[PDB]
A paper describes a structure:
NQO1 constitutes an important enzyme of the cellular defence system and plays a central role in the activation of quinone-based chemotherapeutics. Among other functions, the dimeric flavoprotein is catalysing the conversion of quinones to hydroquinones preventing the formation of semiquinone radicals. Yet, another important role is the regulation and stabilization of various tumour suppressors like p33ING1b, p53 and p73. The broad substrate specificity of NQO1 allows the activation of chemotherapeutic prodrugs, like mitomycin C or β-lapachone.
The two most prevalent variants in the human population are NQO1*2 (NQO1 609C>T; NQO1 P187S; allelic frequency: 0.22–0.47) and NQO1*3 (NQO1 465C>T; NQO1 R139W; allelic frequency: 0.00–0.05), which are connected to a higher risk for specific cancers. The structure was determined to 2.1 Å and contains four protein chains in the asymmetric unit. The subunit structure of the R139W variant is also virtually identical to the wild-type structure with the exception of the amino acid replacement at position 139. The respective average rmsd in this case is 0.18 Å for a superposition of 230 out of 271 Cα-atoms. Preparations of the R139W variant showed the typical yellow colour indicating that the protein tightly binds the FAD cofactor in stark contrast to the P187S variant that was isolated largely as an apoprotein. The average of three measurements was used to determine the KD values for the NQO1 R139W variant as 155 ± 27 nm, which is 2.5-fold higher than the KD for wild-type enzyme. Thus, it can be concluded that the arginine to tryptophan replacement has only a marginal effect on the binding affinity of the FAD cofactor. The values for kcat and KM are virtually identical for WT enzyme and the R139W variant for both NADH and menadione again indicating that the single amino acid replacement does not affect the kinetic properties. In the case of the NQO1 R139W variant, we found that the crystal structure as well as the solution structure, as evidenced by NMR-spectroscopy, is virtually identical to the wild-type protein.
Residue numbers in the entry:
A (entry chain C), B (entry chain B): 3 to 273
Amino acid sequence: GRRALIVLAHSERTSFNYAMKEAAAAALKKKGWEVVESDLYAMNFNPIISRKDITGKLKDPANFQYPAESVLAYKEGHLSPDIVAEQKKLEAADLVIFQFPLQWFGVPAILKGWFERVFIGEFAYTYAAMYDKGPFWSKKAVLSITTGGSGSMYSLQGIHGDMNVILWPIQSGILHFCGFQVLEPQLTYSIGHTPADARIQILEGWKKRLENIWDETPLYFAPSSLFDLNFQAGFLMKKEVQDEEKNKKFGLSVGHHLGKSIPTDNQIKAR
Amino acid sequence: GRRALIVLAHSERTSFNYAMKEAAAAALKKKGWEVVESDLYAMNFNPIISRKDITGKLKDPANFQYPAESVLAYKEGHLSPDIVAEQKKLEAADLVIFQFPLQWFGVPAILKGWFERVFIGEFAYTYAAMYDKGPFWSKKAVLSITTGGSGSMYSLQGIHGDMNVILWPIQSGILHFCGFQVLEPQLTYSIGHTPADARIQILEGWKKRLENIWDETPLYFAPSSLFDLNFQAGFLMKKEVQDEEKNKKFGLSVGHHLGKSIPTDNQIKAR
Ligand SMILES: Cc1cc2nc3c(=O)[nH]c(=O)nc-3n(C[C@H](O)[C@H](O)[C@H](O)COP(=O)(O)OP(=O)(O)OC[C@H]3O[C@@H](n4cnc5c(N)ncnc54)[C@H](O)[C@@H]3O)c2cc1C
Ligand SMILES: Cc1cc2nc3c(=O)[nH]c(=O)nc-3n(C[C@H](O)[C@H](O)[C@H](O)COP(=O)(O)OP(=O)(O)OC[C@H]3O[C@@H](n4cnc5c(N)ncnc54)[C@H](O)[C@@H]3O)c2cc1C
């Protein structure tokens, strides 16, 4: 069996988010997965990066810089116990599910703090090995999101704008940057206005998808080989690559739109 | 005699972010501004939403729903006073400056939670009063952001992709949604690789800009008058507007790209 980690960011057992977490765990276990969860609220997880994330002496206590100090602590085994426990969950996991309600067009603060304290340099990323060469290359991640607003609001013509744009900083910036293959997000729009029978089927749909989740085609991101990955070239797209794209009508992705048309549902549907 | 609020999200008084906050306060005060600060770390601000944000019995404790419960607490005066104190800072402020290091392509968790606990419904937004009809329509907000990554990384051809996409969920989804006119963000790229002399100039340029900050043209967002703002129409773009926009080369904004070219630096430069 593969290993699954479910990171849940919701404080209520009675929420649809909790129900989705239970549905996921149940479905995966039946298919032979070992399932571990991170119920951040139940954990009362400390969401705030600080010098307390490092046990014992710092390298430069008078001028504390979290990136350098947290990296050093990781290498020397001096990270805070709660951080280390989470990192071990990540290392064991093949599939990571992030279950959360959309909050101010992003992840809840407690989940954002989880990323900030757990995704430490060298462990989760290096400038030498980033995006598709990232440490989590063998792992797959998926966002399971619930929203208050309807799907129409997040359509191209909706008042909020394209949901693909909202998803990008998370799926590309956080997950893919660390090497994750990112699967199509499970989007549950206006769950507060969804009829009872329909909420039941959404749960069943989620269970059914997870039966074959590992064999899905992941979302498309621009491969890192298209870029000159060094400070001298400023991590810019290769000259020959740019030349080849000048005849193309569509951009490569949401973030790499190149001033052209973004491919439809680049962050919502796989090729 | 206008009033400014500076929200800072950095743990270290020795940081450049703190220096930017200090420079902003002094520059504004010299021009006669009243300046109030929210140093979230120094305030030990709690960024995690919970039932205890309501200082009394809940309307529906068996099924706790934060949006409805927090709005009810707001109207009845049963919001936690640490939230109330922040809300009063916002009421008095004409200009709001958010000073923070870019962290995982968004705001630090402590600031995210600040938005989540303080921007309560009715106080900060309603489905009737949203975007340009929002409660903060008379106010202006600006992001002052420092990054570890270079500006080229966030260019159209950069490995991280377009920064305008990264800014959208914050500037449109959080700030503009509540009514704020959003001014051009102060972007300070690769501050960790900036020589001492250039760091001095960055501080001065920030001070110089703030001398006439209120006279600046705000960023462009699609006007809400272009949309049918009701649930029956799903808050979609008006039929006449859609047909008219079909003849426009560029999308309206980052989020309202409409599957077309995004206007250059829509979230970075004013028209
Ligand atoms: C601070 C904040 C910011 C927000 N920002 C945004 C935003 O930017 N955009 C946006 O769209 N929304 C936003 N929201 C709204 C938020 O996304 C929704 O309130 C949330 O997604 C609702 O999910 P829930 O899990 O709380 O469901 P709940 O509202 O708790 O439950 C929904 C329904 O599911 C039912 N249910 C529960 N368990 C089961 C089960 N086992 N089987 C069947 N039915 C069940 C419940 O009875 C309920 O009727 C925000 C909310 C907050 C508090
Ligand atoms: C969890 C996390 C996630 C991150 N995610 C991202 C990301 O997604 N993208 C990205 O690009 N970056 C990211 N970063 C990097 C981050 O954006 C930078 O570390 C941050 O912007 C640096 O700001 P600072 O104020 O800490 O600078 P500091 O490192 O504190 O200061 C830089 C220099 O300024 C000098 N200085 C301080 N005060 C003064 C003064 N008064 N006058 C002159 N000089 C002074 C200091 O001596 C120091 O040498 C992340 C960092 C963390 C910790």
